[PDB]
Design a protein around this ligand. Structure first.
Ligand SMILES: Nc1ccc2[nH]c(-c3cnn(-c4cccc(CNC(=O)Nc5ccccc5)c4)c3O)cc2n1
Ligand SMILES: [Ca+2]
Ligand SMILES: [Cl-]
Ligand SMILES: [Cl-]
Ligand SMILES: [Cl-]
Lengths: 250, 58
């Protein structure tokens, strides 16, 4: 996250840190005790699926304070339509091996109904994006969880205001064009969270692009609303052997 | 009332019905109040709420 602030400990309790071989991989979003939403591309190059770890209740990477909860990732589900090394359909659903325990420091973000998301949430201007990503384009990653308020743009407006990435119906634009504020490398898979009438919902997933906080360009996020039904169906399904699962979309 | 407008007055989720009918609903871990629009938590840790903040104002 570029141009944000530290998320005060416990104020981003749905934030997930994904590790591979103990190294920072990506972000994620807790939506239930055993389910995490991330970005497909995070898993493009995964060699050994058995060493994937999800951490909840994380804040400061430099210390252990006992609020942290680590779980092995049992399943990574990606849509059939996703092509590695690209941006369209950049979403993944992760099943934890064992549920996390809900605490003051570990809480799921609400996955909204599609209608609600499309009719209401989509019109909430500002939403929060978070992670332990790079603090700067070509910079070092954060030790403390960072958060950033970003405004959403209608795709038409985005395209107009921009000056490349093709914006599909499975994406949306959010942020700033002045190169001051963006999500960044290391943040991918993290939440774009939207407040409505006292409650927070998952509306986006930090995808990727070339660089961060590039003048004349906005952040592009996976439009979660397109995936609600897909996610819901999967969550009702029994686990399958083998970590990686490609599931038809729609 | 219609869901597309003002969220049908619903705090959370909204369903249109046959007639001038509307039903509000709530996410798991919430229950609908008798006002037919509001959602209140039924569990300790409902989704999309920040405990340290909820407490901060409790
Ligand atoms: N403004 C922003 C905002 C968020 C951003 N995130 C990134 C970024 C860069 N690399 N990864 C990454 C993370 C974790 C695993 C991986 C492996 N995946 C493949 O290597 N796929 C691949 C497949 C085929 C060909 C090339 C690559 C890649 C990123 O998240 C840039 C960026 N910019
Ligand atoms: Ca820690
Ligand atoms: Cl585990
Ligand atoms: Cl099944
Ligand atoms: Cl496997």
């Amino acid at each position: 996250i570029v141009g944000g602030k530290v998320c005060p400990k416990g104020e981003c309790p749905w934030q997930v840190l994904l590790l591979v071989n103990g190294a920072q991989l990506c972000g994620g979003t807790l939506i239930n005790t055993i389910w995490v939403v991330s970005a497909a591309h995070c898993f493009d190059k995964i060699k050994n699926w058995r060493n994937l770890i999800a951490v909840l209740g994380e804040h400061d990477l430099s210390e252990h304070d006992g609020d942290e909860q680590s779980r092995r990732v049992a399943q990574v589900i990606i849509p059939s339509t996703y092509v590695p090394g690209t941006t369209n359909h950049d979403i993944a659903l992760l099943r934890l091996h064992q549920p996390v325990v809900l605490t003051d420091h570990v809480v799921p973000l609400c996955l909204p109904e599609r209608t609600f998301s499309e009719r209401t949430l989509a019109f909430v201007r500002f939403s929060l994006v978070s992670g332990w990503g790079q603090l700067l384009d070509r910079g070092a990653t954060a030790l403390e969880l960072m958060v950033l308020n970003v405004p959403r743009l209608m795709t038409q407006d985005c395209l107009q205001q921009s000056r490349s990435p093709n914006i599909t119906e499975y994406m949306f634009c959010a942020g700033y064009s002045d190169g001051s504020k963006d999500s960044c490398k290391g943040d991918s898979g993290g939440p774009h969270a939207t407040h409505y009438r006292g409650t927070w919902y998952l509306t986006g997933i930090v995808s990727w692009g070339q660089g961060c906080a590039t003048v004349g360009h906005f952040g592009v996020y996976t439009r979660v609303s397109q995936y609600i039904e897909w996610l819901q169906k999967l969550m009702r399904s029994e686990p399958r052997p083998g970590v990686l699962l490609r599931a038809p979309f729609p | 009332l219609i869901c597309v407008n003002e969220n049908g007055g619903c705090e959370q989720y909204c369903s249109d019905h046959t007639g001038t009918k509307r039903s509000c609903r709530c996410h798991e871990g919430y229950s609908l109040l008798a006002d037919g629009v509001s959602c209140t938590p039924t569990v300790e840790y409902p989704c999309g709420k920040i405990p340290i903040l909820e407490k901060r104002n409790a």
